[PDB]
Scaffold this active site. Structure first.
Site, short mmCIF file in Angstrom:
data_model
loop_
_atom_site.label_atom_id
_atom_site.label_comp_id
_atom_site.label_asym_id
_atom_site.label_seq_id
_atom_site.Cartn_x
_atom_site.Cartn_y
_atom_site.Cartn_z
N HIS H 61 30.57 -16.66 -13.83
CA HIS H 61 31.90 -17.19 -13.55
C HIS H 61 31.80 -18.56 -12.88
N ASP H 91 34.66 -49.72 -25.96
CA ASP H 91 34.08 -48.37 -25.94
C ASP H 91 33.17 -48.29 -24.71
N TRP H 126 25.46 -18.13 -8.02
CA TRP H 126 25.21 -19.43 -8.69
C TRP H 126 24.18 -20.30 -7.93
N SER H 156 22.57 -33.95 -19.56
CA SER H 156 23.85 -34.40 -20.09
C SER H 156 24.61 -35.25 -19.05
N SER H 157 24.73 -34.73 -17.83
CA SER H 157 25.43 -35.43 -16.76
C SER H 157 24.72 -36.66 -16.21
N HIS H 240 26.03 -29.98 -2.04
CA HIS H 240 27.20 -30.57 -1.41
C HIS H 240 27.71 -31.76 -2.23
N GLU H 242 27.63 -32.20 -5.22
CA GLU H 242 28.29 -31.56 -6.37
C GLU H 242 29.74 -31.16 -6.09
N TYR H 244 31.77 -32.61 -4.11
CA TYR H 244 32.55 -33.86 -4.07
C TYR H 244 32.66 -34.48 -5.48
N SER H 255 45.93 -40.10 -7.64
CA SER H 255 46.41 -41.42 -7.26
C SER H 255 47.29 -42.02 -8.38
N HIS H 290 25.06 -27.42 6.24
CA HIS H 290 26.17 -26.58 6.71
C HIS H 290 26.31 -25.32 5.82
N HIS H 291 25.51 -25.27 4.76
CA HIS H 291 25.45 -24.13 3.85
C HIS H 291 24.28 -23.23 4.29
N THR H 316 39.03 -38.62 4.22
CA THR H 316 39.87 -37.77 3.38
C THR H 316 41.32 -37.85 3.84
N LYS H 319 43.23 -40.81 2.47
CA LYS H 319 43.68 -40.58 1.11
C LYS H 319 44.96 -39.75 1.08
N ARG H 438 31.04 -11.53 0.95
CA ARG H 438 31.22 -12.07 -0.40
C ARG H 438 30.23 -11.27 -1.22
C1 HEA Z 1 36.46 -29.42 -4.45
C2 HEA Z 1 35.36 -28.91 -3.85
C3 HEA Z 1 35.05 -28.94 -2.37
C4 HEA Z 1 35.45 -29.85 -1.44
C5 HEA Z 1 36.15 -31.19 -1.66
C6 HEA Z 1 35.04 -29.32 -0.14
C7 HEA Z 1 35.27 -29.91 1.08
C8 HEA Z 1 34.86 -29.48 2.35
N1 HEA Z 1 34.09 -28.31 2.60
FE1 HEA Z 1 33.67 -26.93 1.33
N2 HEA Z 1 32.86 -25.84 -0.05
C9 HEA Z 1 33.03 -25.84 -1.45
C10 HEA Z 1 33.74 -26.78 -2.16
C11 HEA Z 1 34.37 -27.87 -1.62
N3 HEA Z 1 34.39 -28.12 -0.28
C12 HEA Z 1 32.25 -24.77 -2.08
C13 HEA Z 1 32.14 -24.49 -3.58
C14 HEA Z 1 31.64 -24.09 -1.05
C15 HEA Z 1 30.83 -22.83 -1.08
C16 HEA Z 1 29.68 -22.79 -2.06
C17 HEA Z 1 29.03 -21.42 -2.16
O1 HEA Z 1 28.50 -20.94 -1.13
O2 HEA Z 1 29.02 -20.85 -3.28
C18 HEA Z 1 31.97 -24.75 0.16
C19 HEA Z 1 31.38 -24.37 1.38
C20 HEA Z 1 31.61 -25.01 2.60
C21 HEA Z 1 30.85 -24.78 3.80
C22 HEA Z 1 29.85 -23.65 3.99
C23 HEA Z 1 30.51 -22.36 4.47
C24 HEA Z 1 29.55 -21.21 4.45
O3 HEA Z 1 28.93 -20.94 3.38
O4 HEA Z 1 29.41 -20.56 5.50
C25 HEA Z 1 31.26 -25.69 4.73
C26 HEA Z 1 30.69 -25.89 6.00
O5 HEA Z 1 31.05 -26.71 6.84
C27 HEA Z 1 32.32 -26.46 4.07
C28 HEA Z 1 33.02 -27.53 4.65
C29 HEA Z 1 33.84 -28.41 3.95
C30 HEA Z 1 34.51 -29.55 4.57
C31 HEA Z 1 34.57 -29.90 6.07
C32 HEA Z 1 35.13 -30.23 3.59
C33 HEA Z 1 35.88 -31.53 3.82
O6 HEA Z 1 35.42 -32.49 2.85
C34 HEA Z 1 37.40 -31.36 3.73
C35 HEA Z 1 38.18 -32.55 4.28
C36 HEA Z 1 39.67 -32.44 4.04
C37 HEA Z 1 40.58 -32.21 5.01
C38 HEA Z 1 40.23 -31.95 6.45
C39 HEA Z 1 42.06 -32.12 4.59
C40 HEA Z 1 42.76 -33.48 4.46
C41 HEA Z 1 42.82 -34.27 5.73
C42 HEA Z 1 43.84 -34.52 6.59
C43 HEA Z 1 45.26 -34.09 6.34
C44 HEA Z 1 43.53 -35.42 7.79
C45 HEA Z 1 43.59 -34.81 9.18
C46 HEA Z 1 42.54 -33.69 9.36
C47 HEA Z 1 41.88 -33.38 10.50
C48 HEA Z 1 42.00 -34.16 11.77
C49 HEA Z 1 40.98 -32.17 10.55
N4 HEA Z 1 32.46 -26.07 2.77
C1 HEA Z 2 35.89 -24.79 -10.48
C2 HEA Z 2 35.53 -23.67 -9.84
C3 HEA Z 2 36.18 -22.33 -9.91
C4 HEA Z 2 37.41 -21.91 -10.44
C5 HEA Z 2 38.47 -22.66 -11.25
C6 HEA Z 2 37.53 -20.50 -10.07
C7 HEA Z 2 38.59 -19.69 -10.42
C8 HEA Z 2 38.75 -18.33 -10.04
N1 HEA Z 2 37.84 -17.60 -9.26
FE1 HEA Z 2 36.15 -18.21 -8.56
N2 HEA Z 2 34.33 -18.75 -7.95
C9 HEA Z 2 33.72 -20.03 -8.04
C10 HEA Z 2 34.30 -21.12 -8.64
C11 HEA Z 2 35.57 -21.14 -9.26
N3 HEA Z 2 36.43 -20.04 -9.31
C12 HEA Z 2 32.42 -20.08 -7.41
C13 HEA Z 2 31.59 -21.33 -7.30
C14 HEA Z 2 32.19 -18.80 -6.94
C15 HEA Z 2 31.01 -18.24 -6.17
C16 HEA Z 2 30.04 -17.45 -7.05
C17 HEA Z 2 28.87 -16.87 -6.25
O1 HEA Z 2 29.13 -16.21 -5.21
O2 HEA Z 2 27.71 -17.08 -6.64
C18 HEA Z 2 33.36 -17.99 -7.28
C19 HEA Z 2 33.55 -16.68 -6.82
C20 HEA Z 2 34.73 -15.96 -6.99
C21 HEA Z 2 35.07 -14.73 -6.27
C22 HEA Z 2 34.18 -14.06 -5.25
C23 HEA Z 2 33.23 -13.10 -5.92
C24 HEA Z 2 32.38 -12.32 -4.92
O3 HEA Z 2 32.15 -12.85 -3.81
O4 HEA Z 2 31.97 -11.18 -5.24
C25 HEA Z 2 36.34 -14.34 -6.64
C26 HEA Z 2 37.03 -13.20 -6.23
O5 HEA Z 2 38.22 -13.05 -6.32
C27 HEA Z 2 36.80 -15.37 -7.57
C28 HEA Z 2 38.01 -15.35 -8.26
C29 HEA Z 2 38.48 -16.37 -9.11
C30 HEA Z 2 39.75 -16.35 -9.80
C31 HEA Z 2 40.71 -15.14 -9.82
C32 HEA Z 2 39.90 -17.55 -10.37
C33 HEA Z 2 40.96 -18.09 -11.26
O6 HEA Z 2 41.39 -17.15 -12.26
C34 HEA Z 2 42.16 -18.72 -10.55
C35 HEA Z 2 43.13 -19.39 -11.53
C36 HEA Z 2 42.45 -20.55 -12.33
C37 HEA Z 2 42.35 -20.64 -13.68
C38 HEA Z 2 42.90 -19.51 -14.50
C39 HEA Z 2 41.65 -21.81 -14.38
C40 HEA Z 2 42.45 -22.33 -15.56
C41 HEA Z 2 41.81 -23.54 -16.22
C42 HEA Z 2 41.66 -23.70 -17.56
C43 HEA Z 2 41.82 -22.51 -18.48
C44 HEA Z 2 41.31 -25.02 -18.21
C45 HEA Z 2 42.46 -25.56 -19.04
C46 HEA Z 2 41.94 -26.71 -19.85
C47 HEA Z 2 42.61 -27.84 -20.18
C48 HEA Z 2 44.07 -28.02 -19.85
C49 HEA Z 2 41.90 -29.00 -20.83
N4 HEA Z 2 35.84 -16.40 -7.73
CU LIG Z 3 28.79 -28.50 1.50
#
Ligand code: HEA
Ligand code: HEA
Ligand SMILES: [Cu+2]
Ligand SMILES: CCCCCCCCCCCCCCCCCC(=O)OCC(COC(=O)CCCCCCCCCCCCCCCCC)OC(=O)CCCCCCCCCCCCCCCCC
Ligand SMILES: CCCCCCCCCCCCCCCCCC(=O)OCC(COC(=O)CCCCCCCCCCCCCCCCC)OC(=O)CCCCCCCCCCCCCCCCC
Ligand SMILES: CCCCC/C=C\C/C=C\C/C=C\C/C=C\CCCC(=O)O[C@H](COC(=O)CCCCCCCCCCCCCCCCC)COP(=O)(O)OCCN
Ligand SMILES: CCCCC/C=C\C/C=C\C/C=C\C/C=C\CCCC(=O)O[C@H](COC(=O)CCCCCCCCCCCCCCCCC)COP(=O)(O)OCCN
Ligand SMILES: CCCCC/C=C/C/C=C\CCCCCCCC(=O)O[C@H](COC(=O)CCCCCCCCCCCCCCC)COP(=O)(O)OCC[N+](C)(C)C
Ligand SMILES: CCCCCC/C=C\CCCCCCCCCC(=O)O[C@H](COC(=O)CCCCCCCCCCCCCCC)COP(=O)(O)OC[C@@H](O)CO
Ligand SMILES: CCCCCC/C=C\CCCCCCCCCC(=O)O[C@H](COC(=O)CCCCCCCCCCCCCCC)COP(=O)(O)OC[C@@H](O)CO
Ligand SMILES: CCCCCC/C=C\CCCCCCCCCC(=O)O[C@H](COC(=O)CCCCCCCCCCCCCCC)COP(=O)(O)OC[C@@H](O)CO
Ligand SMILES: CCCCCCCCCCOC1OC(CO)[C@@H](O[C@H]2OC(CO)[C@@H](O)[C@H](O)[C@@H]2O)[C@@H](O)[C@H]1O
Ligand SMILES: C[C@H](CCC(=O)O)[C@H]1CC[C@H]2[C@@H]3[C@H](O)C[C@@H]4C[C@H](O)CC[C@]4(C)[C@H]3C[C@H](O)[C@]12C
Ligand code: CUA
Ligand SMILES: [Mg+2]
Ligand code: NA
Ligand SMILES: [Zn+2]
Lengths: 98, 46, 58, 79, 43, 84, 227, 514, 259
Positions: H61, H91, H126, H156-157, H240, H242, H244, H255, H290-291, H316, H319, H438
């Protein structure tokens, strides 16, 4: 310690590379490598926009350092003005390859 | 050269909306069904 | 050795509508067909292997 | 004597979460001491503190595997 | 945005058909597998 | 640094050929001399079946699965010791 | 343990866990404020027919919306780091217990004086005694003395696992070849539950941790009887 | 002609189209897997009765949503379609290499599907952490096929990143500086730079896992002096950046959408937006640990990663507030795309803020590996990325196809999806705070209520997805051809008609230097 | 007709054959590692070589023969190669990180020391030093080759380039011999792991770099390069320097400091 045997661009460049090279030598820019310099852009002194057809997209950076570029199609005929700053542009069509 | 314009810049045909419906149904449907059948495959191995 | 680049430039600029990967002549066609045949055949073979490996042989 | 040990005390040489080296160090020390004492003609009881510390900290399987290796002649540490 | 009228309008009846066919293409196969889950588990 | 030589008034092909034959290749010749002198087979150490060496978690996909890719009978013992 | 319809953290069993509750309250307030403010402002920008579409100057409001967030982050960071360092302070335990993660159960070792050790498996749902918790009960609990500083050493004999007890604010990964340290201190007697917190395969969901906190006197007789 | 055009393409629009098609199909696969996840958790007990299968489903997934849906759509789809048009380029710089970036994805996807078909699949998470992913706990071809799938997607990427960076740097009009390019183009370039630097580290790490599994190396095996924690560092060093990489192109499209439907000729504080994206990209490389707050790290290291992570909130925030400042004083057009953008702003903020809660290592000890993390990323990543993709899709669909969607149906789709995602994920915060781990196939009885509600919400989103397919069908079925588009003076990509001709900008734009 | 200086490439089958060959090699490795067969791998390696050959053949046709490489196109290719090399640097960075992580904190299984107990490292003053002078020297000769080309000297360009290649081949032969002579193997714990995988990937890069230089050698023999337009040679040289610098880091880290 020295000798020859390596061709030069003048002797061996071909196709588009050669064209750009020969044109640049005559001070011409048929392949739009350079940014054209602006005139005063008035009704009497419009910016002359070359084209090989009857319309060309113009991008106007109204003021120096503006991050927003104003885009519009410039058609053959009477001079048109930038929608934002009003500076004038006039299309001067055709040719390139004799 | 290639065809251009609405409905011509795509790898599938939109000439007939029903044949199109069938195509989109197989396309998106095959994608959505695959995990269910993979799970089924794994359950039936042992 | 002698410089025969001009001959090659004439050959590859000849207006015959051929894409660059085939513009050299009959050999290009053969090499292309060999390449594509090995790729498509090898891919079919890989699918076969996947089908074989997908099931247990206990 | 000078004992009355509850458990291995805080050791400033190993102040962090990873305690692997603390266990390893005390195991090596005990066996180095035990060797020197049984060698030059002395008492193993001076090596007691290290034995207690490593026994407290080290997983049974580690101590067991290391003991087996010293016996086999494959213990990588210097004793 | 402005656009011209549909070249091949899709009436409400036609939309009900497209919508139904679409929903069925997702629901039937998955439904089938899920329904027969116990048949797979121990067999 | 600046080396210990000089030129720099114009670094061209002649200068780089001078460096190739006057410094580079002579350095390679010297190192080739030093190496094909300090070589001579070293007496292989006694075998000790250390557990952090001669690792085998899955057989190698070649030979009998127990020999490394560039296995040298003279210096590379198997998990059970040197070969015959 | 967690109870039905729980919204927040399990009640604090140790002083550190209490500390985290107060810190989370503080942080959550800020999270609520900022998210509600953003939602509010979105609605404010979208509810007026008045317009101003000409170029707007930015280098003035960018100071405010850069300095304010920076201050809020420091307001979160201060109490956060105070707790981090507080947890780390030297405490000198009275007892050391080791726990080894295994593919699908935990084993414990109390080897300060005697060589005591045992396995701890989840009670199958079919064998639960009336009133016992599904997926949480173990055959052999981790008996420990209440109101005492204990050193927990965590490792594994196969894959990664993670030893956790939410009520005490604990979670330490169990890594083979590594000996991770954490300290435990319960302010009250009782039973405290946790679950393996690092995916370890098929039965990751089924290898819980149960701590039984009793007075020192009972802990000693239990150790004796367990040899 | 069909094969020449669709298999041998060297056109940025056609390749972007293949990417959107590939991504939409992958999204269906990813959605089905997510429904299987939520079905297993829909009520106490076991459904699949096989937890290794459940683990394989969770793993696949994540890979599918990340590598096959999000990245292909944002970068390969919107990037290829829009970047050359937005800078007036004929292009991409390497139009043939661009085609290989696309064609490496189907094989990569096939390898992923193959890993789940052979043996018992890769039920690793994953993150693919050893020893669980090693040749003893996961013997057989599954994990090796997963590693190879990632290698292909990585190549590819990486080649795509080289293409975009070169194109954006080298192919703008002579008079256009980098500070005169649209924010989407900036978002793609920064994303490409992160891809270029992070993917090779992941490649190194998974290659080391491959050799540990097949060549008897012991990089992560203690028996040979290796360390499982080393893999975590290499993985997250890529990981991380990734996350972003997954949101940056989204920020770019947001934007444009917000500016466009606010009736504005430009986003508020352009240079501040550029600064914000660059800072986020930079800071995104120095916060990875932090992970790993529970792996047993020194306290000073933990204090550093807590602090560095929090700092990302500053850029952030600029923005977020700039998007709000772009709306300010606008003649708001309540189109379906604007709704997606507004939903994005709010949902992304929520997820970002819970990320700030997690940044604090002290609290993370308790929240790590619980559903609080799953709730955090499904808000910022799942909703954030998906909402940006939907907003961009409905906004540019008329450009790509030449046809309009039914606005009413699209607003209905947004409404359903908004309810669905919030009902699915919001309750997960509660499950996390209260301690539910989880990657669990079942849970203690107390967690039943929230898991039940979460699984129900997952069905609502399924309804939205099926409706989306119908909506696209209806657009193509009715054939309402586009006539006029507003604001083309500040949206160059629309200036060549809908759809633009195969070859655009054969005669480049004219831009004075003054 | 276009009025910009960029290259619109003819529709090509290479991207597809290349992608399929990637599938065949990965599938092939899996079949080899698990189902003891090299059939898929062989086909994969073959189609990969064929793809690279035809793809780069066409780039030569498009530039030397058709003149599509205007200054703007060449400028893009410069960026493309620099970016490619940067990604390769990061790939090696992961291996150096692996090396330093293991060596800076030797675990008890190694004897808690580096090099591990039972490991007898090569003498960095012997063949490793020779290899170092060999690559450094080829860096000097390729610079002579470059200046000769720019100065229009065909004979000396060919001479210098030949010497550079011979040096690359000498390095490869020396390394192959070192591999055979080494008393430690890739299965000798983390020491053998980090040693062989890092120097192994470097060795692969030396072979790729040598091949690229050989391609330039033949293109030069056929007069493709002009004294002013020769990007293929420039790319080969940049790549060669990268390979040289990676070796210096390997030598300093693994061979010298890690001994
Ligand atoms: C779109 C993808 C995306 C983005 C952009 C972010 C953004 C951030 N993530 Fe998240 N993060 C994930 C995807 C993402 N993350 C995923 C996939 C995981 C788990 C992976 C896994 O284990 O499988 C994860 C896990 C994860 C962890 C690990 C948790 C754990 O496993 O125990 C942490 C730890 O600090 C964290 C922190 C943050 C922070 C601080 C930001 C910051 O960049 C966010 C900043 C944004 C804001 C704060 C909001 C906007 C700001 C304002 C309105 C201004 C004022 C705000 C303040 C003064 C606070 N993230
Ligand atoms: C981009 C990242 C992404 C997206 C979209 C989603 C979408 C969803 N995920 Fe997520 N999920 C992850 C990334 C993502 N997830 C990751 C990284 C993990 C951790 C795995 C791990 O632990 O190893 C995870 C784990 C995870 C868990 C935890 C599993 C566990 O800990 O045992 C759960 C549980 O509810 C969950 C639920 C869902 C559901 C219900 C949706 C969705 O159904 C919500 C609704 C969204 C959609 C239905 C998408 C629709 C988009 C399209 C169809 C494209 C359309 C195309 C065009 C228009 C061009 N996900
Ligand atoms: Cu991170
Ligand atoms: C897998 C494919 C399903 C097969 C079904 C096809 C049947 C053909 C019969 C055949 C009947 C012949 C009819 C002729 C013409 C029309 C049909 C067509 O030509 O047939 C094929 C065409 C067309 O595709 C279709 O057929 C219908 C698709 C409709 C899509 C609507 C999308 C709307 C969203 C908007 C997207 C952006 C465009 C908008 C903007 C407009 C563009 C500018 O495709 C392609 O040639 C290219 C697509 C390539 C890749 C996409 C995803 C593949 C993933 C594979 C990974 C597998 C891993 C293993 C996985 C193994 C599985 C277990
Ligand atoms: C469907 C879920 C049903 C949940 C029902 C709760 C049951 C109450 C029992 C009634 C029983 C009351 C007695 C219980 C007291 C125990 C207090 C404590 O120890 O436990 C502390 C816990 C519990 O939390 C609470 O102290 C209650 C807070 C409830 C917030 C509800 C928001 C609901 C929005 C509507 C649907 C959600 C989707 C919207 C998305 C919101 C974004 C997060 O704190 C948390 O960590 C949970 C939330 C964490 C993170 C989210 C931050 C962003 C919030 C955004 C606000 C947007 C507002 C605009 C308004 C939103 C406009 C859309
Ligand atoms: C097992 C090993 C195998 C690996 C070898 C790797 C690469 C070698 C391959 C080929 C190299 C040799 C020759 C190359 C092919 C043709 C060369 C002929 C050109 C020539 O004769 O060049 C002359 C240079 O001398 C020359 O070769 C001189 C070349 C010889 C240089 C090194 C010899 C060292 C002799 C002892 C001195 C060492 C002392 C050290 C002092 C301190 C140094 C700072 C200059 O003359 P010209 O009149 O200006 O030139 C007109 C046009 N040619
Ligand atoms: C002569 C110097 C040049 C080195 C390379 C030349 C020949 C070897 C074949 C391929 C090498 C290419 C890359 C390196 C990959 C693994 C390490 C190989 C380094 C090497 O060759 O190490 C050898 C081990 O061989 C082994 O297992 C080798 C086993 C061969 C199987 C190759 C396995 C393929 C794995 C490749 C994964 C590719 C992933 C690439 C990702 C790219 C980015 C997306 C050392 O031999 P030994 O007997 O253990 O010790 C010597 C004792 N007398
Ligand atoms: C967590 C921390 C963050 C929280 C809060 C931050 C919010 C800030 C709140 C208020 C900002 C105050 C800015 C003051 C600017 C005055 C507005 C104005 O009126 O706008 C213009 C000024 O240009 C200008 O500054 C350009 C136009 C206005 C400048 C600022 C516009 C954006 C304001 C914010 C937008 C809402 C988003 C807030 C984010 C929280 C008007 O120009 P003039 O009068 O010259 O011409 C008119 C012709 N006369 C001379 C005949 C009247
Ligand atoms: C076994 C385990 C995994 C295996 C995965 C293998 C994946 C694919 C294998 C087959 C690929 C080989 C095919 C040859 C590719 C040549 C690409 C090339 O040379 O691309 C060039 C662009 O990149 C440039 O310059 C500079 C960049 C040069 C790129 C060279 C491509 C190498 C591919 C491998 C990359 C690995 C990533 C490294 C990081 C770890 C040229 O661009 P085109 O658009 O073609 O033309 C534009 C025209 O104007 C030219 O006249
Ligand atoms: C260069 C930028 C500015 C520098 C600012 C600081 C940030 C990174 C510094 C880089 C070098 C640092 C080396 C310091 C060594 C001290 C730490 C050490 O000794 O760490 C070791 C590993 O370091 C290791 O591999 C360290 C190996 C690398 C880790 C850092 C990651 C960066 C790598 C990618 C950078 C890409 C740049 C491109 C290069 C051309 C071992 O593990 P410890 O955790 O110590 O175990 C001891 C425990 O038993 C005690 O509890
Ligand atoms: C047993 C050996 C097999 C091993 C596998 C790899 C084999 C060989 C790899 C060597 C690559 C050879 C590349 C040859 C490229 C020839 C085409 C060329 O060099 O093309 C040039 C452009 O550069 C261009 O595309 C530059 C293109 C850059 C390509 C370089 C990429 C290196 C490939 C690395 C792939 C593996 C990655 C590592 C795996 C971990 C053409 O322009 P000019 O030279 O200016 O000519 C024009 C003038 O004549 C006009 O007057
Ligand atoms: C997570 C995504 C899943 C969403 C839920 C699916 C929604 C409902 C789908 C309906 O699909 C089906 O309905 C059946 C029952 O109503 C089945 O019939 C079956 O049951 C029967 C009677 O109960 C029989 O008539 C047939 O033999 C039969 O196989 C079954 O095949 C299936 O196609
Ligand atoms: C100088 C540079 C570009 C200005 C321009 O050339 O137009 C601008 C763009 C964004 C600005 C930054 C962003 O506005 C964010 C910060 C805002 C604070 O008011 C000052 C520092 C602050 C970090 C700014 C410093 C500087 O003024 C920046 C970096
Ligand atoms: Cu043990 Cu999860
Ligand atoms: Mg964890
Ligand atoms: Na369940
Ligand atoms: Zn203007």
């Amino acid at each position: 310690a020295s000798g020859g045997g390596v061709p030069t661009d003048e002797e061996q460049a071909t196709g588009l590379e050669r064209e750009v090279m020969l044109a640049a030598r005559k001070g011409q820019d048929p392949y739009n490598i350079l940014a054209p310099k602006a005139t005063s852009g008035t009704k009497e002194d419009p910016n002359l926009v070359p084209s090989i057809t009857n319309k060309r997209i113009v991008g106007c950076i109204c003021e120096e350092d503006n991050s927003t570029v104003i885009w519009f199609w410039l058609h053959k005929g009477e001079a048109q003005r930038c929608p934002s700053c009003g500076t004038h542009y006039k299309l001067v069509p055709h040719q390139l390859a004799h | 050269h290639y065809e251009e314009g609405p409905g011509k810049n795509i790898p599938f045909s939109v000439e007939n909306k029903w044949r199109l419906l069938a195509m989109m149904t197989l396309f998106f449907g095959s994608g959505f069904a695959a995990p269910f059948f993979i799970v089924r495959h794994q359950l039936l191995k042992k | 050795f002698e410089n025969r680049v001009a001959e090659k430039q004439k050959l590859f600029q000849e207006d015959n509508g051929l894409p660059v990967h085939l513009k050299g002549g009959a050999t290009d066609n053969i090499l292309y067909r060999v390449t594509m045949t090995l790729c498509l055949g090898g891919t079919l073979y890989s699918l076969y292997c996947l089908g074989w490996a997908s099931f247990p042989h206990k | 004597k000078i004992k009355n040990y509850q458990t291995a005390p805080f050791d400033s040489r190993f102040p962090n979460q990873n305690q692997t080296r603390n266990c390893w160090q005390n195991y090596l020390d005990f066996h180095r001491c035990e060797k020197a004492m049984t060698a030059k003609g002395g008492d193993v009881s001076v090596c007691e503190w290290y034995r207690r510390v490593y026994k407290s900290l080290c997983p049974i399987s580690w101590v067991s595997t290391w003991d087996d290796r010293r016996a086999e002649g494959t213990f990588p540490g210097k004793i | 945005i402005t656009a011209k009228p549909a070249k091949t309008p899709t009436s409400p009846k036609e939309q009900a058909i497209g919508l139904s066919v679409t929903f069925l293409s997702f629901l039937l196969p998955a439904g089938w597998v899920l329904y027969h889950l116990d048949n797979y588990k121990k067999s | 640094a600046s080396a210990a030589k000089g030129d720099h008034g114009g670094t061209g092909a002649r200068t780089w050929r001078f460096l190739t034959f006057g410094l580079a290749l002579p350095s390679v010749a010297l190192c080739t001399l030093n190496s094909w002198l300090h070589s001579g087979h070293r007496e292989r150490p006694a075998f000790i079946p250390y557990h952090h060496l001669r690792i085998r978690t899955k057989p190698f996909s070649w030979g009998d699965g127990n020999h490394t890719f560039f296995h040298n009978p003279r210096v590379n013992p198997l998990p059970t010791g040197y070969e015959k | 343990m967690a109870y039905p319809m729980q919204l927040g953290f399990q009640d604090a069993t140790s002083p550190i866990m209490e500390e985290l509750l107060h810190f989370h309250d503080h942080t959550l307030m800020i999270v609520f404020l900022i998210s509600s403010l953003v939602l509010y402002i979105i609605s404010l920008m979208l509810t007026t027919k008045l317009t101003h579409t000409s170029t707007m100057d930015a280098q003035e409001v960018e100071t405010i919306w850069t300095i304010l967030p920076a201050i809020i982050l420091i307001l979160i960071a201060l109490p956060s780091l105070r707790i981090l360092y507080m947890m780390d302070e030297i405490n000198n335990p009275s007892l050391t217990v080791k726990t080894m993660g295994h593919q699908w159960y935990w084993s414990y070792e109390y080897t300060d004086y005697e060589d005591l050790s045992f396995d701890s498996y989840m009670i199958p749902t079919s064998e639960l005694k009336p009133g016992e918790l599904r997926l949480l009960e173990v055959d052999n609990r981790v008996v420990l003395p209440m109101e005492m500083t204990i050193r927990m050493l965590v490792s594994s004999e196969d894959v990664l696992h993670s030893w956790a007890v939410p009520s005490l604010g604990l979670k330490t990964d169990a890594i083979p070849g590594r000996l991770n340290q954490t300290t435990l201190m319960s302010s009250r007697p009782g039973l405290y539950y946790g679950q393996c917190s690092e995916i370890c395969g098929s039965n990751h969901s089924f290898m819980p941790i149960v701590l039984e906190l009793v007075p020192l006197k009972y802990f000693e007789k239990w150790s004796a009887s367990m040899l | 002609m069909f094969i020449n055009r669709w298999l041998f393409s060297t056109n940025h629009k056609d390749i972007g189209t293949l990417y959107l098609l590939f991504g939409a199909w992958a999204g269906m696969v990813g959605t089905a897997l997510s429904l299987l996840i939520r079905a297993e958790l829909g009520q106490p007990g076991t459904l699949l009765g096989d937890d290794q299968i459940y683990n394989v489903v969770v793993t696949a997934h994540a890979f599918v949503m990340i590598f096959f849906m999000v990245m292909p759509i944002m970068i390969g789809g919107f990037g290829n379609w829009l970047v050359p048009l937005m800078i007036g380029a004929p292009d991409m710089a390497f139009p043939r290499m661009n085609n290989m970036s696309f064609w490496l994805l189907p094989p990569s996807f096939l390898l992923l599907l193959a890993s789940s078909m052979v043996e018992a699949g890769a039920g690793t998470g994953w993150t693919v952490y050893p020893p669980l992913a090693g040749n003893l706990a996961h013997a057989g071809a599954s994990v090796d096929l997963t590693i190879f799938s990632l290698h292909l997607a990585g190549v590819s990427s990486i080649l795509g990143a080289i293409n975009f960076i070169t194109t954006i740097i080298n192919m703008k009009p002579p008079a256009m500086s980098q500070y005169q390019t649209p924010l989407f183009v900036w978002s793609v370039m920064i994303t490409a730079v992160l891809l270029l630097l992070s993917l090779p580290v992941l490649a190194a790490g998974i290659t080391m896992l491959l050799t540990d599994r097949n060549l008897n190396t012991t990089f992560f095996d203690p028996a040979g002096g290796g360390d499982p924690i080393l893999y975590q560092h290499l993985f997250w060093f890529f990981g991380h950046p990734e996350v972003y990489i997954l949101i940056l192109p989204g920020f770019g499209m947001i934007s444009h959408i917000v500016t466009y439907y606010s009736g504005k000729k430009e986003p508020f504080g352009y240079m501040g937006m550029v600064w914000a994206m660059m800072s986020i990209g930079f800071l995104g490389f120095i916060v990875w640990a932090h992970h790993m707050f529970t792996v047993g790290m020194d306290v000073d290291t933990r204090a550093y990663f807590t602090s560095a992570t929090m700092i990302i909130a500053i850029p952030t925030g600029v923005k977020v507030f700039s998007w709000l400042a772009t709306l300010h004083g606008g003649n708001i057009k309540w189109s379906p795309a604007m709704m997606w953008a507004l939903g994005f702003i709010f949902l992304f903020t929520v997820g970002g803020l819970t990320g700030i809660v997690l940044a604090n290592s002290s609290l993370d000890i308790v929240l790590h590996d619980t559903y609080y993390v799953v709730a955090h990323f499904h808000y910022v990543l799942s909703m954030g990325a998906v909402f940006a993709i939907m907003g961009g899709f409905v906004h540019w669909f008329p450009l790509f196809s030449g046809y309009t969607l039914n606005d009413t149906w699209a607003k209905i789709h947004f409404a359903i999806m908004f309810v669905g995602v919030n009902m699915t994920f919001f309750p997960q915060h509660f499950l996390g705070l209260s301690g539910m781990p989880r990657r669990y196939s079942d849970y203690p009885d107390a967690y039943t209520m929230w898991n039940t509600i979460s699984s129900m919400g997952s069905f609502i989103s399924l309804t939205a997805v099926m409706l989306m397919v119908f909506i696209i069908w209806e657009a193509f079925a009715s054939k309402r051809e586009v006539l006029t588009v507003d604001l083309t003076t500040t949206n160059l990509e629309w200036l060549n008609g809908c759809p633009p001709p195969y070859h655009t900008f054969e005669e480049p734009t004219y831009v004075n230097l003054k | 007709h276009q009025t910009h200086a960029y290259h619109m490439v003819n529709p090509s089958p290479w991207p597809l054959t290349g992608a399929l060959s990637a599938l065949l090699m990965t599938s092939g490795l899996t079949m080899w590692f698990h189902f003891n067969s090299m059939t898929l791998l062989m086909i994969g390696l073959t189609t990969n070589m064929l793809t690279m050959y035809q793809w780069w053949r066409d780039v030569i046709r498009e530039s030397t023969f058709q003149g599509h490489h205007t200054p703007a196109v060449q400028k893009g290719l410069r960026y493309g190669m620099i970016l490619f090399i940067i990604s390769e640097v990061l790939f090696f960075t992961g291996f150096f990180w692996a090396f330093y992580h293991s060596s800076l904190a030797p675990t008890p299984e190694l004897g808690g020391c580096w090099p591990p107990t039972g490991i007898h490292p090569l003498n960095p003053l012997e063949v490793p030093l020779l290899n170092t002078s060999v690559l450094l020297a080829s860096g000097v000769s390729i610079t002579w080759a470059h200046h000769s080309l720019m100065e229009g000297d065909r004979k000396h360009m060919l001479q210098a380039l030949f010497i550079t290649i011979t040096l690359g081949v000498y390095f490869t032969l020396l390394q192959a011999s070192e591999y055979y002579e080494a008393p430690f193997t890739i299965s000798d714990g983390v020491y053998g792991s980090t040693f062989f995988v890092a120097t192994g990937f470097h060795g692969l890069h030396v072979i790729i770099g040598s091949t690229f230089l050989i391609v330039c050698f033949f293109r030069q023999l056929k007069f493709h390069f002009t004294s002013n337009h020769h990007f293929g040679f420039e790319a080969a040289a940049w790549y060669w320097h990268f390979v040289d610098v990676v070796w210096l880091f390997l030598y300093v880290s693994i061979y010298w400091w890690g001994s």
